[PDB]
Amino acid sequence: DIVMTQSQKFMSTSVGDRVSVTCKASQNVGTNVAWYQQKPGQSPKALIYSASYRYSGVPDRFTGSGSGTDFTLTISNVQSEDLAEYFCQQYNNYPLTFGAGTKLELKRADAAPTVSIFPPSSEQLTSGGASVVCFLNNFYPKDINVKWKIDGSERQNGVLNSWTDQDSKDSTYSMSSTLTLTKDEYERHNSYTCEATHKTSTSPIVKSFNRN
């Protein structure tokens, strides 16, 4: 099978600038090459066919070029909405084969996280379980650390963490951290603390609530 090699797994630029992703065919595929954009959680969208022709609705900011074995997708005036994974594809030979995909990243200034903590809902407490949720929204860069303290004592058992992709509006990241306990163990303690360590501050951002 023809190997469509996208040399870079990640491509980076700033908003308003331009980015170019290359794709290397192992054999001459002429110009029978297509490009696809796939935003998170969405179906793939075709951008380019015949190496350099745009599908209807695709802005002129997306341009394709190349012939034979070397192909390039260029995104001009990049906006936060262009955050997606971009695949090259050859349809000159069977079977049709895609590239591995190049994920677009946007460079921006640092941003401290907005931290919110939420006690277990009275509805969940009827089930016998207790989840404490901490949202860490709109921060940059992605590297961040969250420590759960129960009455000033670190607790790392039962911590479920989830990170979003880069936000399609301001190019920031968000994180959700859930500490799940049993109902009886949650009522055996009082102080529940979510501490956020990020490079935007030497001191951790602290959010706490008392079960009373």
Partner 1 sequence: QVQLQQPGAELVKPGASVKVSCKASGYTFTNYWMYWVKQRPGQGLEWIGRIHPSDSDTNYNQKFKGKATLTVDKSSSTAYMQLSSLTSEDSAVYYCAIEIYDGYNTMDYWGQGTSVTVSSAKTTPPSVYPLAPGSANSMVTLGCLVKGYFPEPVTVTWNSGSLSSGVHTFPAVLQSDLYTLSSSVTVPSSTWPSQTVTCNVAHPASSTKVDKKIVP
Ligand X SMILES: CCC(=O)N(c1ccccc1)C1CCN(CCNC(=O)CCCC(=O)NCC(=O)NCC(=O)NCC(=O)NCC(=O)O)CC1
Q: Shortest gap between Cβ of 116 and partner 1 (angstroms)? A: 4
Q: Shortest gap between Cβ of 121 and partner 1 (angstroms)? A: 4
Edge-to-edge strand ranges of the sheet holding 205-210: 153-155, 145-150, 191-197, 205-210
Q: Shortest gap between Cβ of 169 and partner 1 (angstroms)? A: 8
Residues 90-129 within binding reach of partner 1 (CB under 8 A): 94-101, 114, 116-127, 129
Please state, in angstroms and rounded to a whole number, the distance separating the CA atoms of residues 169 and 93.
39
Residues 25-54 within binding reach of ligand X (CB under 6 A): 34, 46, 49-50
Token reading at 34: 């297509």
The stretch among 10-18, 19-27, 159-167, 193-201 that binds partner 1 (CB under 8 A) is 159-167
Contacting residues toward partner 1, per CB under 8 A: 36, 38, 43-46, 49, 53-60, 85, 87, 89, 94-101, 114, 116-127, 129, 131, 133, 135, 137, 160-165, 167, 169, 174-176, 178, 180, 209
